[PDB]
Amino acid sequence: AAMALFDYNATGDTEFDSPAKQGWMQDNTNNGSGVLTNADGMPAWLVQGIGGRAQWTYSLSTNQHAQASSFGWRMTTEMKVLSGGMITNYYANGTQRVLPIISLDSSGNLVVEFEGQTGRTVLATGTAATEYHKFELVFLPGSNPSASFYFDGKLIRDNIQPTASKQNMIVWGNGSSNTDGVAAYRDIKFEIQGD
Ligand SMILES: CC(=O)N[C@H]1[C@H]([C@H](O)[C@H](O)CO)O[C@@](O[C@H]2[C@@H](O)[C@@H](CO)O[C@@H](O[C@H]3[C@H](O)[C@@H](O)[C@H](O)O[C@@H]3CO)[C@@H]2O)(C(=O)O)C[C@@H]1O
Numbered sequence: 547a548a549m550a551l552f553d554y555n556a557t558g559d560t561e562f563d564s565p566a567k568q569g570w571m572q573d574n575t576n577n578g579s580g581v582l583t584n585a586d587g588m589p590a591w592l593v594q595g596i597g598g599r600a601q602w603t604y605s606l607s608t609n610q611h612a613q614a615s616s617f618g619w620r621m622t623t624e625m626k627v628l629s630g631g632m633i634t635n636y637y638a639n640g641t642q643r644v645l646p647i648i649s650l651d652s653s654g655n656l657v658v659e660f661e662g663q664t665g666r667t668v669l670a671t672g673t674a675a676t677e678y679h680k681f682e683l684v685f686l687p688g689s690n691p692s693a694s695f696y697f698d699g700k701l702i703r704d705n706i707q708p709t710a711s712k713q714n715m716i717v718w719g720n721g722s723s724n725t726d727g728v729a730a731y732r733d734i735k736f737e738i739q740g741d
């Protein structure tokens with residue numbers, strides 16, 4: 547030991563055909579919604595943050611928060627952004643978060659921002675901007691805790707400093723009631739490491 551993994555895996559299976567059935571909590575407001583969809587012969591969960599917030603949350607236990615802090619963690623998302631912004635797939639711990647905010651800019655490019663930084667980074671232009679990609683957030687602890695962001699396995703930004711936050715969920719989706727955001731999710735993992 548010791549390691550742990552928490553996931554949503556998009557599936558047609560009845561027993562597990564929403565995130566609610568994989569231990570995640572629906573956390574929409576207003577007009578926000580979601581539904582199982584099927585795209586490339588493959589299930590995806592379509593998050594529809596149109597006129598309301600639309601996201602899913604997962605609760606770590608007391609020891610899991612603490613283990614996450616000692617040994618570090620990795621959050622991987624496989625998604626495709628369809629429209630808008632505040633696509634917020636992230637982890638908060640009662641005290642801090644590394645928040646990447648993903649979107650499509652007014653030129654149609656897939657950009658990423660991080661809370662604590664200012665500016666956007668172009669991840670994909672053209673028809674690439676609105677296809678599936680694999681996004682990794684990798685948190686390395688120490689007395690100098692920083693994060694690294696990866697896009698189909700390519701270091702994009704490192705030395706991302708955590709920022710204060712009272713929230714304490716693993717979250718994915720459109721974490722915003724006013725910024726509309728739409729994306730499809732095949733996979734979410736949050737893995738707590740060993741040493
Ligand atoms: C990623 C994340 O942390 N998302 C939060 C968001 C964002 O921080 C926010 O959208 C900024 O873009 O806020 C969410 O909560 C807000 C939401 O419940 C709205 C209701 O529309 O209320 C906000 O508080 C209000 C408060 O009611 C007012 O009295 C006061 O003026 O301050 C706020 C006005 O904006 C909540 O903060 C959200 O749902 O968008 C929660 C996300 O998790």
Ligand SMILES: [Ca+2]
Binds near residue numbers: 607609610
């Ligand atoms: Ca435990």
